Design a protein around this ligand. Structure first.
Ligand SMILES: O=C1CC(I)=CC=N1
Length: 280
């Protein structure tokens, strides 16, 4: 590469290959995301201004040789790998709580600046060595439009709603919270309908009482099976009532009833939050 030394594939990202790369001029290590191929360039370039401690810094947008690359700061590890490495012991609760608190601060920041993620998942959550966690790839899905992960997708998206809101990110984060606590994905679907029925079997099939308008959504079918709703108490033991209360509010069916990031930060679950050092 003209402008990088020591370029190494990390893996396949949402939009193309992701590399660890060394900037030739400065010697810094960055995450270089190739976008597999006018409006998207200016919109993503605005994200270079969207800066916060819990947001992965977008350093540059490189548009050269009719190719597009996003340059992000490089962080030590992603949460999917950390979760896998932590599976035998579990992530300690104080660290789960710290990470959730920080992720909510990142969401609250982006949402206050009218930027959504729309595709949060553990792979886009990055950790450093001292206890910070950051979200990557905010804003890309609006700008741009191996198998896709559906496990974190909000039910309105699965039911074919064409209108995103902040609530989609709260749903995904709730699913990630549950997975940290139980060491198992909450809703590991392998197709849209398996994902949908996995949510319905746990939370009950939604209806007009809990979710006004649900029956008029594009992909809703009156023939869906009607499951009764289970209790978070069987789903995420041994999480305490404060954690279950918060999670329950993050996973309301109606996006309009889902707790906001800002309100979640005030929840009693976080009264005793701290910032521990992770065991890498
Ligand atoms: O900065 C990063 C990105 C990814 I994907 C993995 C680890 N560090």
């Amino acid at each position: 590469m003209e402008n990088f030394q020591k370029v190494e594939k990390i893996g396949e990202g949402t939009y193309g290959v992701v590399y660890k790369a060394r900037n030739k001029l400065t010697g810094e290590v960055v995450a270089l995301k190739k976008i597999r191929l006018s409006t998207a360039i200016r919109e993503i370039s605005l994200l270079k201004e969207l800066n916060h401690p819990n947001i992965v810094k977008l350093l540059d947008v490189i548009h050269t040789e009719n190719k597009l690359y996003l340059v992000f700061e490089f962080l030590h590890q992603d949460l999917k790998k950390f979760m896998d490495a932590s599976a035998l012991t579990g992530i300690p609760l104080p660290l789960i709580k710290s990470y959730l608190f920080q992720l909510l601060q990142g969401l609250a920041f982006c949402h206050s600046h009218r930027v959504l993620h729309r595709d949060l998942k553990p792979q886009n959550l990055l950790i450093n060595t001292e206890g910070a966690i950051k979200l990557a790839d905010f804003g890309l899905a609006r700008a741009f439009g191996e198998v896709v992960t559906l496990w974190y997708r909000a039910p309105e998206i699965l039911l074919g709603c064409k209108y995103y809101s902040t609530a989609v990110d709260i749903w995904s984060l709730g699913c990630i919270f549950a997975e940290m606590v139980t060491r198992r994905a909450l809703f590991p679907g392998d197709s849209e309908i398996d994902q949908l029925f996995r949510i319905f079997r746990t939370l009950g099939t939604p209806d007009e009482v809990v979710w006004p308008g649900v029956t008029s959504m594009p992909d809703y079918k009156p023939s869906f099976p009607k499951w009764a709703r289970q209790d978070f108490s069987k789903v995420v033991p041994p999480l305490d009532e404060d954690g279950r209360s918060l999670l329950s509010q993050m996973l309301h069916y109606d996006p309009n009833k889902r707790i906001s990031a800002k309100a979640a930060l005030a929840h009693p679950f976080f009264q005793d939050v701290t910032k521990p050092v992770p065991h890498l």
